[PDB]
Design a protein around this motif. Structure first.
Motif, PDB file in Angstrom:
ATOM      1  N   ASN A 232       0.795  -1.213   0.000  1.00  0.00           N
ATOM      2  CA  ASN A 232       0.000   0.000   0.000  1.00  0.00           C
ATOM      3  C   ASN A 232       0.827   1.261   0.000  1.00  0.00           C
ATOM      4  O   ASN A 232       1.856   1.357   0.681  1.00  0.00           O
ATOM      5  CB  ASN A 232      -0.951  -0.006   1.216  1.00  0.00           C
ATOM      6  N   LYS A 233       0.358   2.233  -0.760  1.00  0.00           N
ATOM      7  CA  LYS A 233       0.855   3.587  -0.622  1.00  0.00           C
ATOM      8  C   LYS A 233      -0.332   4.468  -0.265  1.00  0.00           C
ATOM      9  O   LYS A 233      -1.418   4.325  -0.828  1.00  0.00           O
ATOM     10  CB  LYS A 233       1.535   4.056  -1.908  1.00  0.00           C
ATOM     11  N   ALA A 234      -0.135   5.365   0.685  1.00  0.00           N
ATOM     12  CA  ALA A 234      -1.221   6.197   1.152  1.00  0.00           C
ATOM     13  C   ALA A 234      -0.802   7.646   1.096  1.00  0.00           C
ATOM     14  O   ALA A 234      -0.065   8.112   1.959  1.00  0.00           O
ATOM     15  CB  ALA A 234      -1.597   5.820   2.574  1.00  0.00           C
ATOM     16  N   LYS A 254      -5.643   9.113  -0.917  1.00  0.00           N
ATOM     17  CA  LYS A 254      -5.598   8.162  -2.020  1.00  0.00           C
ATOM     18  C   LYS A 254      -4.806   6.912  -1.656  1.00  0.00           C
ATOM     19  O   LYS A 254      -3.633   6.986  -1.291  1.00  0.00           O
ATOM     20  CB  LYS A 254      -5.049   8.834  -3.293  1.00  0.00           C
ATOM     21  N   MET A 255      -5.488   5.775  -1.737  1.00  0.00           N
ATOM     22  CA  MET A 255      -4.887   4.472  -1.572  1.00  0.00           C
ATOM     23  C   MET A 255      -4.476   3.935  -2.946  1.00  0.00           C
ATOM     24  O   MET A 255      -5.217   4.063  -3.916  1.00  0.00           O
ATOM     25  CB  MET A 255      -5.927   3.499  -0.989  1.00  0.00           C
ATOM     26  N   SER A 256      -3.309   3.306  -3.017  1.00  0.00           N
ATOM     27  CA  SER A 256      -2.967   2.520  -4.181  1.00  0.00           C
ATOM     28  C   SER A 256      -2.128   1.332  -3.761  1.00  0.00           C
ATOM     29  O   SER A 256      -1.662   1.276  -2.620  1.00  0.00           O
ATOM     30  CB  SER A 256      -2.252   3.358  -5.246  1.00  0.00           C
ATOM     31  N   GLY A 257      -1.964   0.384  -4.687  1.00  0.00           N
ATOM     32  CA  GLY A 257      -1.287  -0.872  -4.430  1.00  0.00           C
ATOM     33  C   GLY A 257      -2.343  -1.933  -4.263  1.00  0.00           C
ATOM     34  O   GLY A 257      -3.523  -1.646  -4.396  1.00  0.00           O
ATOM     35  N   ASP A 258      -1.937  -3.146  -3.917  1.00  0.00           N
ATOM     36  CA  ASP A 258      -2.864  -4.269  -3.872  1.00  0.00           C
ATOM     37  C   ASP A 258      -3.786  -4.325  -2.639  1.00  0.00           C
ATOM     38  O   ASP A 258      -4.738  -5.107  -2.634  1.00  0.00           O
ATOM     39  CB  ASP A 258      -2.085  -5.583  -4.022  1.00  0.00           C
ATOM     40  N   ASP A 284      -7.522   0.983  -3.422  1.00  0.00           N
ATOM     41  CA  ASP A 284      -7.709   1.971  -4.492  1.00  0.00           C
ATOM     42  C   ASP A 284      -8.594   3.160  -4.132  1.00  0.00           C
ATOM     43  O   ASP A 284      -8.795   4.063  -4.951  1.00  0.00           O
ATOM     44  CB  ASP A 284      -8.251   1.316  -5.778  1.00  0.00           C
ATOM     45  N   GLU A 285      -9.127   3.177  -2.923  1.00  0.00           N
ATOM     46  CA  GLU A 285     -10.047   4.245  -2.554  1.00  0.00           C
ATOM     47  C   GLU A 285      -9.416   5.641  -2.646  1.00  0.00           C
ATOM     48  O   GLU A 285      -8.300   5.864  -2.181  1.00  0.00           O
ATOM     49  CB  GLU A 285     -10.640   3.987  -1.167  1.00  0.00           C
ATOM     50  N   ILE A 316     -13.243   2.382  -5.295  1.00  0.00           N
ATOM     51  CA  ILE A 316     -12.995   1.223  -4.468  1.00  0.00           C
ATOM     52  C   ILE A 316     -13.048  -0.037  -5.290  1.00  0.00           C
ATOM     53  O   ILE A 316     -14.018  -0.287  -5.984  1.00  0.00           O
ATOM     54  CB  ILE A 316     -13.997   1.104  -3.291  1.00  0.00           C
ATOM     55  N   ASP A 317     -11.988  -0.828  -5.211  1.00  0.00           N
ATOM     56  CA  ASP A 317     -11.998  -2.141  -5.801  1.00  0.00           C
ATOM     57  C   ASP A 317     -12.873  -3.079  -4.950  1.00  0.00           C
ATOM     58  O   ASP A 317     -12.619  -3.289  -3.754  1.00  0.00           O
ATOM     59  CB  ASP A 317     -10.570  -2.674  -5.921  1.00  0.00           C
TER      60      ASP A 317
END
Length: 377
Positions: A232-234, A254-258, A284-285, A316-317
């Protein structure tokens, strides 16, 4: 022994916690919850004995009792304190406040930890910390237990079955470049769960008086530690322009990564859009916040404060189905502290929240917290 006794403090807090929650399905009530609890919080903090190495001790007595909705829960904690020059080592019951660990204290009794921590300020403007937490005592619990990671929702955090951790290591620092600009770098590792690097930059910019723009910029990389899938990157930042007794704030997250954001289960995540019900920290949110504060001192009724905020999340995924998850929350807080009379210092706070989504449970929630702290001296 002059500082030891003179700097020593003790207090007893009476704490009343009420909350109700209404799950909404369609435009109707699907189910309700209500909790009511009374708390008694006994605190003691010694000063430090004189000399090159000062010794002190803290003690904590927390008793919670369910009023309705084991009935009794809580804990007693001791902490040994050592201090040389401007460095302090604490062993036992700890309640650290760091970007990589923000202990919960929104219910009746605080979340606490067992371990050892070092805080150091030998160098002007530089604050260093480091430590190891072994055990957590959750707010509704009576004893110490191994830690875990916050899971569930669409965070998409997946962990080896039965996994638990008795080691959370942390180290970090922060430097005040000017009396208006500081940056921080913090590391935390929940053994076997995740590693996290947190970077921070806080800038306060006085336009005039009383006008100010606070810039709170944050970025955290979390990675797995062998037995999870954490990745995660936040990026999250808040800008709060203050004028007089008003404050208008805007936040982006912003969230990214798995997976979503990584944090100790039971703690609060250090995220600008973490609010009353949702942390907006799903895979992904992306979320935006708008917040308004007013302090009624600006007129008549000092000790009365208002706050409201709105947060909108999307992207959101959903993990097991196609399509975009979306959610939004609105919060309203009203708080009063008695400024005089026999009731002086009595605190009362109402926290109101609505959470709506396009993919999971919706609910409303009200919290009333009544609080009165009495020094023993």
């Amino acid at each position: 022994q002059s500082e030891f006794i003179k700097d020593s403090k003790a207090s007893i807090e009476l704490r009343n916690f009420y909350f109700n929650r209404d799950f909404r399905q369609e435009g109707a009530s699907q189910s309700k919850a209500e909790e009511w609890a009374q708390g008694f919080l006994l605190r003691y903090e010694s000063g430090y004995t004189e000399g090159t190495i000062g010794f002190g001790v803290d003690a904590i007595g927390l008793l919670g009792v369910k009023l309705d909705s084991q009935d009794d829960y809580g804990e007693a904690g001791i902490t040994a304190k050592l201090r040389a020059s401007k460095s302090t080592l604490k062993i036992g019951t700890l309640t650290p406040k760091l970007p990589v660990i923000m202990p919960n204290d929104s219910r009746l009794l605080p979340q606490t930890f067992q371990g050892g921590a070092l805080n150091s300020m030998e160098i002007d403007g530089l604050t260093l910390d480091a430590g190891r937490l072994k055990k957590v005592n959750q707010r509704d619990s009576s004893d110490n237990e191994d830690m875990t990671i916050t899971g569930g929702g669409k965070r998409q955090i997946v962990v080896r079955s039965g996994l638990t951790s008795d080691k959370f290591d942390f180290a970090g620092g922060s430097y005040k470049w000017t009396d208006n600009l500081s940056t921080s770098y913090h590391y935390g590792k929940l053994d076997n769960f995740y590693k996290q690097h947190y970077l921070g930059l806080v800038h306060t910019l006085p336009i005039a008086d009383k006008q100010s723009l606070k810039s709170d910029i944050r970025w955290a990389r979390s990675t797995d530690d062998g037995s999870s899938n954490v990745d995660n990157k936040a990026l999250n930042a808040m800008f709060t322009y203050s004028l007089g007794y008003h404050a208008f704030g805007v936040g982006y997250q912003k969230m990214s990564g798995d997976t979503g954001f990584a944090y100790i289960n039971g703690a609060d995540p250090y995220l600008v859009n973490f609010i009353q019900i949702g942390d907006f920290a799903n895979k992904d949110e992306k979320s935006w916040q708008a917040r308004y504060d007013y302090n009624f001192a600006g007129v008549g009724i000092p000790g009365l404060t208002f706050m409201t905020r709105y947060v909108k999340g999307d992207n959101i995924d959903l993990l097991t189905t196609s399509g975009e998850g979306k959610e939004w929350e609105r919060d309203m807080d009203i708080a009063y502290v008695f400024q005089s009379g026999p009731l002086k210092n009595l605190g009362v706070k109402w926290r109101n929240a609505t959470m709506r989504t396009n993919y999971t449970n919706d609910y409303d929630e009200n919290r009333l917290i009544v609080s009165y702290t009495l020094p023993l001296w």
